[PDB]
């Protein structure tokens, strides 16, 4: 179902009278807008086009009020201009109040560049759009957000660094990380947040757990106190929400006999 | 049925091998073309991209051959460029011959401005187009040509001028005029072509007829000899074809007792 048509003044191309007023309500499908232009336009000129006019509207917005033969200082004439609707709807109105030929206009549905919406990549197509993510993330079910793939990694070295996905840059939204540090049965590991610590707060909640002992929920803008664990195996959980601008955290683990 | 999709190198985002070659054949509906662009593009560089490449083709036309990471003097890289197919068809080919991540591309069907066809007015819409004419003409059945409305007019004055529709400018195509000069029963009218005479020739045929007596077929580039009729009523027939640039004719009729 293609959308396009033609509109003309009463009695076109003959002279129009002043006992017939007109309106046309044009509708394109969702995702489209309508473009209209005039091939012939000849209406009497009057201050602010109050006597004779062609008015273009979208919803309550008044896109334009036309009249005359040649645009002036306070009255506008279509010329060869193209008018676009705001939304998939356009209303054209023709009025005349008590020698002019009137007008001929054409309209056609046209695609809307809907990426004028997405977390990472916005892909536009005819009638709609969709989103995609960068390498390392996977589109969420909200179809717009990019969840990070931050789980399944483990640390075996005596000491190492951990952090939020894009540290020191805003971390993924609607993500849920899970970091792991596994060491020999003897050793004992101590964690201490380093550099910066920035997490959305009022707990975006960072939780550190290990065989009987819960830490957190951590949030806020300052390095939380250092933590001396018991185990040689610790797991960290960082769940996020949509808030973007938050640098995140970075932990430097270490262990001793 | 909306057209759009995604293409990637073997094993994307992992490094690609060299035992798998690829092609995708994209098809948009008549009236549309496909646009494609790369979100990720990382292929090994080689002179004229002979070892690794992404080739874009439309029919037999080679729109582009890609490779590398950054365009150079003899090798091209997508960058953030957008590629459009020629016609409603696009073919993407990926090759590799014996550390690079490959590529991710997206494509979407897009409308073709088919008024890049018509006699007078070309109107474009999604998937096709149509034609319209200026005031005084009516679209022919070929859906493209503008026939003139040159019939039904009569002349009653003792003397008057007649001519081709846009004299002295190219006359309408596929038109068929019929002029009439009616005078009192007594008078007798004489016709003589004036100014210019330009009609498509080898008879576009101008014929003058009146109660028993046929004149013509007139064509050519010079004023035809003057004609003294018998009747007080004469009718002229001018039929055209597609040839455009031909000024036409102009007759100055007169009559005497
Ligand atoms: C519209 O464009 C034509 C060229 O095709 C130009 O001659 C004409 O002046 C323009 N009309 C107006 C008033 O904008
Ligand atoms: C593509 O555009 C980005 C801006 O978003 C720019 O930083 C990048 O250099 C461009 N890539 C190339 C190689 O054209
Ligand atoms: Ca769109
Ligand atoms: Ca089109």
UniProtKB/Swiss-Prot annotation, chains A, B:
Glycosylation sites: 80, 245
Modified residues ((3R)-3-hydroxyasparagine): 124
Disulphide-bridged cysteine pairs: 49-67, 118-131, 133-146, 150-177, 203-219
Residues annotated as domain EGF-like: 111-147
Residues in CUB domain copies: 1-110, 150-256
List of residues binding Ca(2+) 1: 44, 52, 97
Residues annotated to bind Ca(2+) 2: 111-112, 125, 128
Protein name as catalogued: Mannan-binding lectin serine protease 2 A chain
Natural source organism: Rattus norvegicus
Taxonomic classification: Eukaryota, Metazoa, Chordata, Craniata, Vertebrata
Gene: Masp2
Residues of the full protein shown: 24 to 297 of 685
């Amino acid at each position: 179902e293609p959308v396009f048509g033609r509109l003309v003044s009463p009695g076109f191309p003959e002279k129009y009278g002043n006992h017939q007023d007109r309106s046309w309500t044009l509708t394109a499908p969702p995702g489209f807008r309508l473009r209209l232009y005039f091939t012939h336009f000849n209406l009497e000129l009057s201050y602010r086009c109050e006597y004779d006019f062609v008015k273009l509207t979208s919803g309550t917005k008044v896109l334009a009020t036309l009249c005359g033969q040649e645009s002036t200082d306070t009255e506008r004439a279509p010329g060869n201009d193209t008018f676009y609707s705001l939304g998939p709807s356009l209303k054209v109105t023709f009025h005349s109040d008590y020698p002019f030929t009137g007008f001929e206009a054409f309209y056609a549905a046209e695609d809307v560049d809907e990426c004028r919406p997405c977390d990472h990549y916005c892909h536009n197509y005819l009638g709609g759009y969709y989103c995609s993510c960068r390498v390392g993330y996977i589109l969420h079910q909200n179809k717009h957000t990019c969840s990070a793939l931050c789980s399944g990694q483990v640390f075996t070295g005596r000491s190492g660094f951990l952090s939020s996905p894009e540290y020191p840059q805003p971390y993924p939204k609607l993500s849920s990380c899970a970091y792991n540090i596994r060491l020999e049965e003897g050793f004992s590991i101590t964690l201490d947040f380093v550099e910066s610590f920035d997490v959305e707060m009022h707990c975006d909640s960072l939780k550190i757990q290990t065989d009987k002992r819960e830490y957190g929920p951590f949030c806020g803008k300052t390095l939380p106190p250092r933590i001396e664990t018991d185990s040689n195996k610790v797991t960290i959980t960082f769940t996020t929400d949509e808030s973007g601008n938050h640098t995140g955290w970075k932990i430097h683990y270490t262990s001793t006999a």
